[PDB]
Amino acid sequence: KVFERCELARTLKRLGMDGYRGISLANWMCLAKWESGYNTRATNYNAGDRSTDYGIFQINSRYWCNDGKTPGAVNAAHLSCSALLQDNIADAVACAKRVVRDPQGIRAWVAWRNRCQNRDVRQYVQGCGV
């Protein structure tokens, strides 16, 4: 499902993402924007280390979800990467919150550093009424 900007921004707000770990909704929009353009189907293979980034937040199968194909990876006791490709983003959100409790926080996604770090991210939540 390709989301609309404000719909997503309201959705994440409902899921408790605003101010989570010191991370505004505006920053969560920025991240999702630059990671998948707001598309839940988004899948990015990483030929070099042979990993895959899944869903709206482009979660990597080596550390947080397992697809079985990834070399050097988390056991099939975890969450399946398929769960991150659904239209409903509650699970991706759940995993997202997990990823960031690690010390580096939001810096986890290099894309956020490149595009969202130390900048005015308000355009993302602009007029969404949240």
Element (H, E) at 93: helix 90-99
Question: Chain centroid to CA 9: how far?
Answer: 13
* Total number of residues shown for the chain: 130
The approach used to solve this structure was X-ray
Q: Which of 4, 7, 53, 120 is catalytic?
A: 53
Joined tokens for residue 6: 């404000």
Q: Which residue has the tokens 């199968």?
A: 61
Q: State the DSSP H helix or E strand holding residue 107, giving kind and residue range, or none if neither.
A: none
Q: Which residues of 6-16 are buried (b: 16+ CB within 10 A; e: fewer)?
A: bebbbbbbebe
CA distances, 26 to each of 5, 13, 48, 82, 123 (Å): 11, 10, 32, 27, 8
Q: Could you tell me if 43 and 52 are in contact, meaning their C-beta atoms sit under 8 angstroms apart?
A: yes
Q: Give every CB contact of residue 40 below 8 A, 6+ residues apart in sequence.
A: 1, 2, 3, 55, 56, 84, 85, 86, 87, 89, 92
Q: Show the tokens assigned to 21.
A: 């770990």
Header resolution in angstroms? 2.2
The encoded tokens of residue 46 equal 């990483």
CATH of 1-130, one of 2.30.29.30, 1.10.530.10, 1.10.287.110, 3.20.20.80: 1.10.530.10
Q: Which long-range contacts (CB under 8 A, 24 or more apart) does 78-81 make?
A: 81/52, 81/54
Which helix (H) or strand (E) covers residue 98, if one does?
helix 90-99
3-class state of residue 80 by DSSP: strand
Note if 35 is an active site residue: yes
Report how far apart, in Å, the C-alpha atoms of 28 and of each of 12, 37, 47 are.
8, 12, 27
Is 67 a known active-site residue? no
| Catalytic-labelled residue, pool 7, 18, 35, 120 | 35
43-46 sheet: strands from edge to edge: 43-46, 51-54, 59-60
Query: What does the H/E/C string look like for 21-69?
Result: CCECHHHHHHHHHHHHCCECCCEEEECCCCEEEECCCCEECCCCCECCC
The residue type at 58? Q
